[PDB]
Symmetry: C2
């Protein structure tokens, strides 16, 4: 075969009044890696909705090991942190604390409940939607009104998300984790056709849907911001680059990054590059290339 098949996330609970997980301040905690785009989704939205003092965060080490994601005391790296709560050493320890029999993959992001010591949700697409409303009572009326998945734009967001996820978000992994030439080509060609499609959508536009920030932008951003700095080279996604092959995408990308601090402050290029290029099965030398220079070009304005 040789093709990459992503497994689904199995912690799919929400935070709702009267439910198992009541909205509370200081109760829920996000375990993430700065390198993981899926995890970065939740960080971006945490800052967009102003949840920084309502939902906590721990940064695991970018240096994925044989035991998974280590905490910062186990595999030090600038900005990587120790687990504040269970003296955990690997993200795995969190999962097996929630369920010693759990047999899924030990992925970030983890939206964690400190009260019952379990995983509420480990599906990035649901965590950012939780963040749209679940904590609105702890927010000012205007910050609470922020909603990245609004009803009036829902279907259009869903329609773009479906193929962006399949051929772009996951497409880069299907290309880079392919182990045959046939599997590699079957992923990378649709990837770049989807980029051609996105380029037309974004021509003369600042946002994918409705001329305003939505989760479709967030979800696409975490892949594209990583494209030139890592996916082009390490994952062989190199038919062309964003900065020189897709001017509309490139402009959209630079405006998100440079004009909206939620996108730039959660973007750590050293974590990103260290993580991908430490994958032995793809890059045995473990060398991290010094390029591209820069990680993202200025807006020029």
């Amino acid at each position: 075969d040789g093709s990459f098949k992503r497994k689904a996330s199995t912690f799919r609970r929400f935070i709702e009044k009267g439910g198992e997980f009541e909205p509370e301040k200081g109760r829920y905690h996000l375990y993430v890696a700065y390198s993981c785009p899926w995890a970065t989704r939740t960080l971006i939205v945490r800052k967009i909705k102003g949840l920084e003092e309502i939902v906590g965060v721990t940064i695991v080490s970018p240096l994925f090991s044989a035991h998974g994601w280590p905490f910062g005391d186990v595999s030090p790296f600038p900005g990587a942190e120790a687990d504040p709560f269970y003296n955990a050493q690997y993200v795995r320890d969190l999962y097996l604390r929630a369920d010693p029999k759990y047999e899924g993959r030990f992925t970030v992001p983890v939206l964690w409940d400190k009260k019952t010591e379990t995983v509420v949700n480990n599906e990035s697409s649901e965590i950012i939607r939780i963040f749209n409303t679940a904590f609105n009572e702890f927010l000012p009326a205007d910050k609470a009104a922020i909603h990245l998945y609004p009803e009036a734009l829902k279907s259009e967001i869903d329609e773009i998300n479906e193929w962006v996820y399949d051929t772009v978000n996951n497409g880069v992994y299907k290309a880079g984790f392919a182990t045959t030439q046939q599997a590699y080509e079957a992923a990378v060609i649709p990837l770049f056709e989807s980029l051609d499609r996105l380029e037309k959508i974004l021509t003369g536009k600042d946002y994918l849907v409705g001329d305003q920030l939505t989760e479709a932008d967030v979800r696409l951003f975490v892949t594209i911001i990583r494209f030139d700095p890592a996916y082009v080279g390490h994952f062989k996604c190199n038919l062309r680059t964003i900065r020189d092959g897709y001017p509309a995408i490139h402009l959209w990308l630079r405006k998100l990054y440079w004009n909206n601090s939620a996108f730039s402050e959660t973007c750590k290029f050293d974590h990103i590059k260290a993580s991908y290029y430490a994958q032995k099965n793809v890059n045995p030398t473990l060398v991290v290339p010094l390029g591209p220079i820069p990680n993202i070009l200025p807006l020029h304005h």
Copy 2:
């Protein structure tokens, strides 16, 4: 120790149909001799055999051993690998079994296996068999020799060898120690070539040939596989990029000897660097058209 020349009255007299080049399209050193062979119109005077680009544990295989489009069988000795030629010439030879090999079919020996000396031989050794315009061509003429040597020195050390020093580095430190001077030399070349068509003397010389074989492989192979990715030629060095496209598109000697499929297959089958053996489909195209902005 195979560093002999072709001169009248010498061990290897200039003769037609006597001398033969064994090369791989993927190797830039070997490609030097292919480019100069066509610049000097030597195609029907000096023969060529294209070995397989799929380098093996036994070295360069011939095309019957490791088939690949355009790779050929050895026409003369049923050789399987390039080493067999070397050991035909001298069973005790203990050097590297490199291409290019400039081979003497008469006495069955290696005349020369140094690409820098082969392309110089080609400047004059066969001029008696050529039309006047091809015979007058000289890529290392006396009046530019010192200038060609000066640029060759650091091009060879930090660019020709440099992409290999970076790409074959096994530590972060060695890698950076190689790639940084590489791109500083490219910055230097960018200045030299701003508003110029040739590195030296406003005319084609071996300096252009020697730089071309590295740069033509830069975006299609060295950027990704050898991590020479601070910036690309096509987007980072417009002067180099123009010089390059003029050589390729205006001079058939540069383009007809350029087989990007051989180049990419050869680099990306290096198991120690790219264990998956996948060959990227990009960049698209391998070299942009001449009238592109």
